[model samples]
Target: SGVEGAAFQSRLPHDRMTSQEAACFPDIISGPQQTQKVFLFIRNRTLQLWLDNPKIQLTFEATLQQLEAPYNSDTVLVHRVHSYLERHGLINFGIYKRIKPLPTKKTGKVIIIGSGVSGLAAARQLQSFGMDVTLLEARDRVGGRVATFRKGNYVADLGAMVVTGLGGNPMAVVSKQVNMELAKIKQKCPLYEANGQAVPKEKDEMVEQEFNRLLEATSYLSHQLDFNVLNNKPVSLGQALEVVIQLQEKHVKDEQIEHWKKIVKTQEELKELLNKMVNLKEKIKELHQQYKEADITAEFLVKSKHRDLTALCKEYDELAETQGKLEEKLQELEANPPSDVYLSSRDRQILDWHFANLEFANATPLSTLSLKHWDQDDDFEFTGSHLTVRNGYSCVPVALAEGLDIKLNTAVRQVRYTASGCEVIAVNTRSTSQTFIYKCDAVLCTLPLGVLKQQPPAVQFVPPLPEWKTSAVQRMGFGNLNKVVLCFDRVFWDPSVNLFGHVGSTTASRGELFLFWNLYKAPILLALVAGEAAGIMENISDDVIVGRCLAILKGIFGSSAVPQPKETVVSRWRADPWARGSYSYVAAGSSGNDYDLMAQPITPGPPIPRLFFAGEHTIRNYPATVHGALLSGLREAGRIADQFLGA
Candidate 1:
């Protein structure tokens, strides 16, 4: 009846219809334009043949336009069209062509050095903007400093771990895209005392409260002041921590004030107690004076008066005892009272725990970190969870390089440029003798700052990089940090906590094992070694490192409780010829401007502008982070796109 009604009301043919597309289907040929919309006598097989037969596309488009917003409704027609398009590999009905035009002009090719996150990110961005890209990695892999080491089924991060803040972070975003297993770590991180005993429950609460307050104050201070290089004596986080600790010490004074206020109850009681205490003090002072006078008088040569003087001495003894107790209470409250105390040798371990945590995040000690930018990072309202990719950290950059050209084992050996173009000299890292040369429009040098600063320089710039770039490279600091992941027969420590930090008097004495993160439910623990320790450990044998870590662990968990690890894996970032160190940092007398200086392309100037820079060291606010590397790449990509792509 509906078909007949529509046939009577419409202007076009509606005779051929499927029992499936007719009765249950919506008002596909909605009356007035039925003549123009519906394909006359169309059948199911004919719809499927629309793609192979391009001649039928026009009729298909008209038929597709008929169904009451066909894309919105779910019917046999919608399902068939979806399956048909998917079969022909026509996603979005080929609308992609209209979104962006094809490259009409040759923008220029890009040759990116270093295959790290920065290099890969720059390659992808530039390629998307219609520029041909080539990514070269010295090692046979990507994700430079983000080295993930594995043993059997257990995974541990060697180079960089934990995406600090996840929201909008490129590393975190790419990791999620590849279905990387990113799980939340437990909230509880227990601190141990120098005696190897965990903070007693009550003390743990106070210690945690104080520790969190210190971190909050430091995080807050990062936004409050500018500790740039101009400050010369840039405040370290250690100084800020001591300042906050002292501030908390004043809280003890508040506690003392309140306690005294309550004990005296009323203002009148305080006045009387003050007066009574003063009178007792006066009586005790007079007793001593009386004794001196009695000794001088000789009681006027009378035994009877001597008895009276002796009675005065007994009165002095009793009054002095009473005065001693009140004065002691007030002085104790005014000075270092029992209630107002700093963390003892045992509780002091927690402060070291916090410093170790800070060092772990930046790959540098807290004392060396700047108060202004130590933890300053882009915050897109992230949950602030540092997560490890169960698969591997390298998977992030690999995902970012999806479908892009990446040359493995091809390390950049030389780079030369002129006003018009650039040439890159590379050699197969597997065989140094094998060499290759690439001629491109532009070259993005994503080499780690450490490599750039190496004595001989990793890559020989034919004409040498500009003076400004060389200065920035030399001014920037390269951090040397490594990880010592241990695989034990079983965990001898608490199972509930995911992370645990050690306590040592000095940075070196802290032992090479600073902190450990339990790798999921495995017996593997990822131990982090930072700065001086990492460099020192790099020179020593793995067996020695293992022995030292075992000794330290035995002292904590007891000789009988802890067992030797089955195996151990250490990162050699310092000795890795290619990567002189782990990451970058703004040196003591330098600022982020140095990073900015390094990021600028060395072209279109006195010499020319064909070489560009993009790395963790090139970024300002986001330096030393994967996101910074990715963003640096994007910055250079946009530069090329604006100059060439006409985007």
Candidate 2:
């Protein structure tokens, strides 16, 4: 009320309120000498009221003197206001207006290579600015890694399926625009032993808790110690985990030894108490006999003897109680002796299963992942639940590609850029003899990291990328995660649970068929082969891969309970020329700065930067995600627009 009263005091116009201005329902006229403090008071209340009744239109005007605050700069204030409007979707909703208008039309041409989510998003954004945009794809169709396969009633997303976070995620907006159904993947994942038995709930939870604690401890240690000082070399995630586990193991053994020592000390105390109690009891009996034998001739002596007997009896009674309690303590200690603190075989198997899951998420093994920056993007993760497209993930790109000019089967060979403009050379995938050159004001390369990491390099640059760019491309990791889609005759595993984990017998085999994802209760299971296992599976025959998966399934659900799949479809992304691997990861010896370097635009004597980069790998905060790719495209588009369109 104190603040409210002050706000009401300044609610009236500073100068005289004229009838004409007062007649205007929503217009507020400020005095020439009004202070920013008063303006903020009015602005805060007015904005709060507007938010409460969003259906109404709000209009107000204030001078720089009245709008600027001591703590915030002019541009910062303007940006906050702009963000507020944009966040509420009111920027173009006729609910707000900008004092400064942009150019009516933008003049420039942009050529985006690789029609992935990033390319498509960039093309659409640049087009919105009235700029000419063209997307080139080597494949016959669009939606690069976001591939969906449909056979009869069964549908499988061979590539990306889950949208990691829905809140503020652009992919969610696209999904909604396309009218795609999104289902939340349940977090409940059940674990099974190698012998086809369900792990006990207590054991499963305990091991999972310990595993999570170990990971947290690893993060703590990574933050505290410098790798160079500790080992004079970069530490891998696997090495850090091993060190933390070993230290924890030693601590647990020390605790067990302390417990054992306490039990031994208690036993010694019990033995001493027993001997003391026996001696006190014997003394008490002797005193009692002496007291009875004493005559009335020595009345005083007899009385003293009786007092001694009473004192001895009291001591013996206390010792007997102490002895009883010690015996109980000894029984309890012996009943539950300290077992080995080391993880049991089954517990190790569960931990390996968890590591396999991490491999799938990172698309790389723990051994090669960077301990310092493996989870660099975790802090920037979007807030909300993970969702999967029910119909297909392709619908998102399909919607984005609408009304855009896309050249299919057009493989880009080289990107030639200069101060004037840029030229992209391409050839038809169907007929390599036919070459085409497209000249544009700028070129946005949305090529995958794996393609960039190619030895010969899939696409050549005229002068070749600078050393910094090329080094970043080499330092970043590109890993594969292949899917083994199995359409079973029926759902053999628990249909209610969305995910299942199978513990492998060896560390190397852990990632092989480690995860089974039930596809919307369609009696279809997608077995994930990630990290090194995916690379190994590439060399094996398809029939053998299918056989290996079946064997694992049989091992989990038992041979009699499980049956052979009617149809099997496996993805070989690594073998594909367009996308050598699945996605990018922060590898050992590489920092998040590499992602920034990848995103850096090549300024070849620029009036404006001609060669721009946009891809999942280019985004440092949200790499290896569909939304990251989409945002990167929009980012480059914004940059080009600001450069050519004069902001």
Candidate 3:
């Protein structure tokens, strides 16, 4: 409560904006040399707060907003930084004094539906745009999905944890404007071998080319897009291979004659037979993964060219064929998203690295479908010593809404055109569900596509949006994301691998870090159970989840694990009746036409002169990331601003 209270009260900016335009240079109190200078100030404030050393605390409260540097200090060293001020010898935290600005009529208002950071950013920019802004937020508080939840003295972000990709995040700029603080973290995690692979000595230099190749292959498969089988229907990769086998006959004779024959007749038969057996074994393993986990030496198994055991060779090939085929198929059906989106220089990398030791062990990777837009991820990457923004992604809505007026708590329900202007119907839950109609020029609607599909997006439109826009809304599909957060009574195994599935082991392995690791300190793992997968997760219980996680730890670590966390919290966002899915995206083989559908713009419904659409799903290339969400908001703001300029 203390840290959170101070962060909120003083606007302690999220860590995503240390050194970028995101942290718009503040011109408030000129500059401060170091965080120590501010720390000294903080110390004084704390003293006064507790000891009643009262030296006009109100004024200090105002002055702290103007203090700025890289952080509480000029530069925050990861290991050296203190989470609380008292670590610096300060006794207590200073509370910000309350101040209320006198209310003035909003000149022009912009209605924003969701209050995720994107909405907050839009509001911040629209206000600067010099228009009376009214932002309508459906949530009770601000900070949309990047939410902070608390229990007693501890706080955890139920939505987004760290402000990944700090440099370009719009929130970073907001933090700079308000002089917020951020923490330093490491990216590009040091590698840890799970499944007991030999730890690479030149680990820091391990070329991820193989890893990337694996990721690419899996990415292609996830969408059932094996280039080899793209034209075909959703047949399993094994089934697809069956098609391959039908087309290409086994050249066992040629292989035996040239490679295994020049020798003994017995050797020839052995090699020939071995090849056939290996292929069958491999194929079956691929088609039936359950059988391969049998008691066999994954380590002692040698990939050799010995032709002595002909049947052995056949068995190996069979195994490879089957295993490869099925793995290719599974890669398409499910896996964890690859975290390669962030280069090692940003917050995402730092946070992800902490859980990297368990990378491939947790979630499987599939074909690269789409990554959340980069603008939202405040990231920078380091190739050796150089750091750069790998993705042109950002929390772009902030920049787009540079100047506009936004209204909050205003949920608009309808609008009618009266010729001279536009009339709108909205409701503020704070008051009543009674719809309130108002006048406006143009409005940009940024709601989830799923919401629109359920009830023609037209209802959300004042009068009626364009037919094409409504049609486009029906075409796109939304992804559902649910996070299950658990707090362990004690720290568990190695903080290496992140599990993306339900691991089941009968052993008492639930207490190790390896067992507990999901995504970062998230103790909270995001289960992207969309479509059928989501349906499966929805049926699971807490005890079931606990059992699976524990069992998984036992398999990975050992059975002698310890007590479960006293408190277990899981977020079934997908299950929430209000939010049917997480975000929007186009479906596959609909001939990829979903992109073109979402591009359609919302024109004036019958009643309103101005109308538009925004949000991640609304954008094509940038869909599903914070950057896309922000860009949608900002783009709409720009259009509204231009509309006003014309007036």
Candidate 4:
């Protein structure tokens, strides 16, 4: 996920970096020159702790710790230690303390907005504690991002497709209580293709190798420049890239040279395989010219990233030789070193081919990345099937939400907080419309970022929100993502073909872009697109999407191989004014700066006895998740209960 406002980078990270997620241990990332100030400080103590006491060895030693007591007690112990850690603060492992609960009050009036998981969780929990509550929502539904559709005979989860692991996530508990069954996602080996013919699924390992090389190069580049927004300031991105290239050429080892050669080819592929790369110099020129005026203003550089990628004329890839050449390049860089590295559990799986192969059960390789066999596990087991849910994808949100009253299409326009209570006004009209004003003791605002950002065409805030909240509302972005659902009169793709794809560098002259597609038991095809891309896709006629899909099929098979479906449905969340984008993701370097800004809450003052906030922005570690949202709501409910019901 990324910031709702930011344009997607359009390219995925090199797949080989997946291994970094698994080796959460810093052994490699901390070696020689790869260490950061954060790691340096910790490494010194880590070595001292092990050398002097030996009680702890690796960072994740806690992962191996055995529980000596019940879950609740362990939580208390963790809380106490976490509190201490927060007070004394370690380089990592800082504890997050629970918020002090609001004092109890009986029969308190509370207003909860947006009936998504967060608001629902809050409403339900508070009701259980005997607090009077009202829930408001905008979408015509309550699941928020968890929207699904039925096509042919299958339920297509058009949004928020996969849930991460079930380990310790609160969603796991909610699912069980709600009786939701999660099917294991099947892992499948991908079939790679080049000029059109399948390159054999085993060839995918080579893709992993190339993927790794590119990641190394990027790390080297990102580090050399220090992730600075205004790196080597006052220079165009193209110029900045030029300077880096010159520096790399002079200092790059021979091995490094070949690694770049292997990767810097997609641009060439734009010409070679797709032949767009033939006009690469020209295409890049066009892309830059368009980007310069493309409405993308880069705050860091004080200029557009215009012409940056094209200006390089990046024949950066001088060779595409053997994996040995690739390995040698990495070994060469071992001396020069690169960026300080941090790896997450998820990132590890990406570095290994097995992670992707295991996740996208129906995926096939599109290029060399798919042409080689990846070495994983000594057992050599291959899981080629996908896992799913019993009632399908919508069960999670629906289950978490059963037994709750949801007011759909209720849009809160203005909140006038007063000395003793608050007034929440909502309207339903285009030019002139009817409005309803509700008086309540408190209110919880959890409206979607997109709808909230407009501050509203038809809605306004009386005694406006705080500057930070207002800024967050404006600064945070809303994006669009759409799911392409197609129902065939019958299965057109091989009853076996689980995934589909196509590649392109730009939208114009764009042949076809496939998230390609995937099929569950559903006997249908689903294609996903996010952000401005989705907005663009939504505006295009359905016929165009089908045409593009057919073109892609032609690329994979022949023109005659294209199949026509009787029904095609598109879920364009971006087009829904109520929602701005699919959930949010950090931009290239915006990183997570928006986190703190969005978390600050509104306190009800005189005239306004009660008011609150919940939803994705309220929770850390769990935002962008129904589970996290629900937990936030529940936490809010607890506060209300304590306030009005406590003796």
Candidate 5:
């Protein structure tokens, strides 16, 4: 029963004993013969040969016996053999086993919480991987922030109108796939003063150059300055611009003062030269009179006096010529008097307009923007002109939503998840009492940053999100950018210009009715209200907002040239519960790192992540664009596929 029996079994030549004989030796023996000492030796040698060369095949009866006895005692080794038999169907007497069946792999089920561009893109990508995907939308429509209003023949995009950076933008791909027509917006933006007069071309160009230089200086300052030297305090973009502008003004003033001094000196020298020339003329006349009256005796003195008079006359002529040049110099200096580098009132107004445009681009005021990292995504910006869809921006989403399992009016209430799987609790927005629970392997959260920033967040996380995730949500800024679309009976402003600006009288009013976009296809003027003004506009009535926009329009064009709109549509993104604001921006204290943190998925369970995030706000390089949202969706979908489906 011990080593003697094992030595007896091992006495057969190893090469002569087949793998099946080695595996089936324990089964052929009696119970008492199956002792640990005998079986351990047999099992070790058989497993060794199998490990060394897996080509060694064993009979079905021998393999079954190996799964028991000493092989089964090695739990990990047993699992390896069991898995192998499962993969390659077990055979009995050279025929396949009819009773045994192979295990079927389960498909991954994913629940996407929003139907925005990010969610739609993710759903499409995951579906292609054969994933069981379900999209739940809060509103009745599919497109979240991207919305368009339609009338008889007019189409106005209420949310996102322009597709920036069309060259490599994913939206371009979608547009081409759907065969949607895109109209390129002309790059001719004209600016008008508060008095309805078009700013002179020269002055407009000068102000444009000055504004761009100031922006460049702000960028340089951000790179050059040491934050540690400032007591580790963060700087706002507005503060940086103020510093640069102040330095520029000081330099201009100094140069102007130096030039003024030169002009004053020339004036004084001109006055002295004129007096000297008058004196020289008088002296010459006196000498000439004395020479004419004197006789031969005074010939020598007369000759000397005459020579002196001639010299004085020559000096007078030279002084007169010099005076003429000095007068010209004075006139030149006065003509182009050192322009008060201190921006003129008009210059300041135009600069304020430019600031408003910046606010529109950022969707936040400069004061709240991070100076060091506000434009961190600039390097990743796609090249080419901005394009607008001729049909409507909403058409892109409508096309993407085809064949998708989307449930509209299903607002997600809470998300509960473990490392293994997750469950979503939602209520029908139309019927508040009707509730549903969705169970899935994973959840892809594509909610906008604005919604995430809600006081009692729109969607609740059962265990509360991690501190890092919540902190990133709070640190990043969600800004407001509303549109006041006016449909006039006929076009009032210049149709040739695609964009125009209004110069507000004060800084507080700069962003109010600042930008007007003329949709050449339709008789529509889309006015953008950004920054603080947009927030204020959200609270006011549509009529009041329209009135204010019209007032600004009347100011730009004469009252007679401007007419009341036949219809008006205003967007109040802040007031809408579904979307708290327009988009995301880098706040004063936050950086691009926050975006990465926001995008990071919570993976309490390994091998597969339970909670995933995707949105424009989650991406640092392409935030605040439709393409950003779309790409983020694709990224999370690919991540899920790699983890769950092994795609």
Candidate 6:
């Protein structure tokens, strides 16, 4: 009795009910309601005390001895806990260690296509490996798609704006050389109504609350389903919607519960709205096609597609005064928001915002982007904040290009690669009348996806790239996410708020001017447009985009003349002869495996990979991002170095 009681008292605290309870005691003791009651006071004062502030130290070795175990490293539980502590920084992981760079075993001349972040990254890595690396840029500038522009005292990025994550990201590594202190992208941006008035804080809170609820539910479903079981699990946007539909429908059929009817009704409303949005978008696409092919001004196109426009408004339903002047319609929405069942301006605004975020984030439509695999990239620890370089994001490519043998205005016409060596046919853009050839041991093609998708193929292959290589390229989707930098006379609106939204009724518009960045460091409101809207802007002039932006600002600021922008720099990625489009993305019908295929070298069989590929398109996990581009480049360099040269 003495040994048993002592053993029980040692393993379990004096006041503890049972030994089994200790397993989950940490979670139990963290109850919200604190105690000051009479029984609680006495419970803590004497024999029954708090487990955390225990009056006894039950010796570990003594406890183990009583439990018929030895105090040794071989003890399973003790060893596991000790090892866990050692791994978690509580104990030593040996010592502070020096990492060795891979030894350069071989060296040869390598030709790199395009001077984008990817190309530059490969060049730098190859140079580090004691290889002669040459970067060929078609354009006069070095930074391919990572272009930084300036106007007066203001500096803004046209190509790659924000450095998404912090970590050992290749972009982060190089960008720090010039501009280290990059500002974190702000989350709390002010929302506006159709009339340019700031949305009330309460309504904003309500909107966020509902959206967060939906987001949580979708995430919960994803978790429950273990969606990415087979690695290439494809969860369509429609499939997620189906879960919600099933839950609502299933509950409605449960004859026992009367309250289930409300759930069904609510789900029906959402489904109805989703279907309507799809129809409205298709109609917009039709109108846009006509506008594009016809090559008419926006004003003329709006007049020509009046019937389609009217139908779109009828679909919105809340926007009753759509045919009249936009001012009158905005005023109508301001006066009275419609019932929940009928689509409101607020509802349209949120959906448009969602679509905008989706496009901007994935550089593709929600329908196309992988629901589970989108963020499945190798995540590493980033330093403090989500940062962008102050000098410029382009400073990365500039720094990477430093001391490297780079030839500007040199465009590659074709690449001929064998197991032995590679030959690149080229043309000087200044002297397009003539051609040149350069022979190298290896060739890395870092060309933009847009340029690669060119009809005749910008850089043709001598042996002709195999069907698999070409098929992967064809299957992958390249998209445009153009930005319009509005350099105003002064900070007109809220200078503090980093982002802007709801410039107009999202219902009536695709929300082309979906978001704008109000940079404190740079006095510029950078407006972003993606997808079809970006394509439309590419067809038009800078003045037309500028005028549209000005009207939007006026509509939101409650002034038709909200002071015209002093200067406007429009980035026409799609229109740019060199780029053709902005970034890489997975299409609706394709998967990341396709991107993996795109990364494969052009060497049909290999002693060493002759034709290497590096670009955002080649990166499976993190496509359409600067980090992806840079990482892909580093990966290609390593691939060549390991296979041809010894690592």
lDDT of 4: 0.48
Question: Lowest-scoring 10 consecutive residues by lDDT in candidate 2?
Answer: 87-96
Candidate 5 deviation (Cα RMSD): 16.8
Model 1: worst 10 consecutive residues (lDDT sum): 88-97
lDDT of 5 by residue, 1-647 (tens): 33232222322232233453335344433445434344444444443333323322443344446554655455544444333222221211011122333223437899998998889888876765567889999999998998989998888898887888664465655665566678788888888888768889998899999999999888877787643114466888988888888998898899899998988899889888888887877787777777677557576777787777788778888888898889998999888876675799889999988998999999988888998899999877767788777677888788778878999999999999887689999999999999999999999999989889999778999768989899999999998889998987788788888888877778876888888887637799888887778888788889998998888888777679778788899998988888898999999899999999988998764455689999999888889888888878877876787788652
TM-score of each: 0.68, 0.76, 0.51, 0.58, 0.76, 0.66
List runs of model 2 lying over 4 Å from the truth.
1-106, 224-229, 256-333
Q: By the TM-score metric, which is better: model 1 or model 5?
A: 5
lDDT (tens digit, per residue) of candidate 1 on 1-647: 34332322221134654443343333554444553234332232233333223222223344445545433243455555443322222221111112344355646788898888788777766654567888888887777887776667677777766666564344443553456787667777665555566666787687667788787787676666543333447777767777777877787678777877644544444456666656755765665455555444465634555555566657656756655665666556556534645666556665566666656556666666666655444433234577766666776776666677899999888898887788899999788899999998888888888899998777898788878889878767787777777887776888777877666656344535767777554678776776457777788788888776777677778999878787788888878987888888655546778878988877655554678888888888678877777778767776665566442
Q: Write the per-residue lDDT of candidate 3 for residues 1-647, one digit (tens) a residue.
A: 43323333222332222232122223212455453344434433333342332112232333344334433243322112221222211221111121433235445655555555445444543454456655555545554544454454333444433333443233343333333344333343333233323224453243343234333344344435434334454333223323333332334335444433233444444556656766666655554553344314533432221232455556665666665655554454334323322223322222233222222121111111121211122232211221121111122223233333444566556655434555667677678656676666544555555556665332455455567666566545555544445555555654453432222111122112232224433233322222333334656786776565455445544666645656655555555533456665443322134544554444443443355566666655456555456545555555565456432
RMSD to the hidden true structure, all candidates: 14.0, 9.4, 19.8, 23.5, 16.8, 23.6
Estimate the TM-score for candidate 2: 0.76
Cα lDDT over the full model 6: 0.63
Q: What TM-score would candidate 4 get against the native?
A: 0.58
What tens-digit string does per-residue lDDT give for candidate 4 at 1-647? Answer: 22110111101121121232224334534455433322322323322222222222222234114223332244433343222222211212101111333235547777777776777667666554456677766666767777767544676776666655554344544555555556654454243232345534434455456445544443444556443344433222223333444553455465455556555553344335334334555666666675655323455433435336634454423222332355455556454543222222222222333322311221111111111111111121212233344455566656545555665667776777755778888765332276777888877777666666663443465666777677665544344456677665545565544554333333221222334455466556676543234556777888887766556556666766556766777766656766665654332222234545565556644332255667765554455555556656665665555456541
Error of 5 at 442 (Å): 1.5
Clashing pairs in 1: 603-608, 603-609, 604-608, 604-609
For residues 1-647, write the lDDT of model 6, one tens digit per residue: 33233222222232433433323233434443332121122222211111222222222342234332222323544433332222221121111111333345637889999998788877766765568788888999988888988767877889877776553343433443344457876787776665667777876676666555555555666567655333354664435534654564455455324334444554555556566667777877777577545446767767767766666656656432332334444345445533323224575476456555656665555555544544445343334456555556766677667677899889888999887798998899998987888899989998888887899787788788888988877877787778888876666677656787753454324547778887636557888886457777677688988887777788777574477777778888887878888887766446688789889987646465789898988987677778778768877877787665653
Q: Summing lDDT over every window of 10 consecutive residues in candidate 5, give the lowest-scoring window.
A: 88-97
Cα lDDT of model 2 by residue, 201-272, tens digit: 998898889889988887887887654224567788888888988987898798789889989999999989
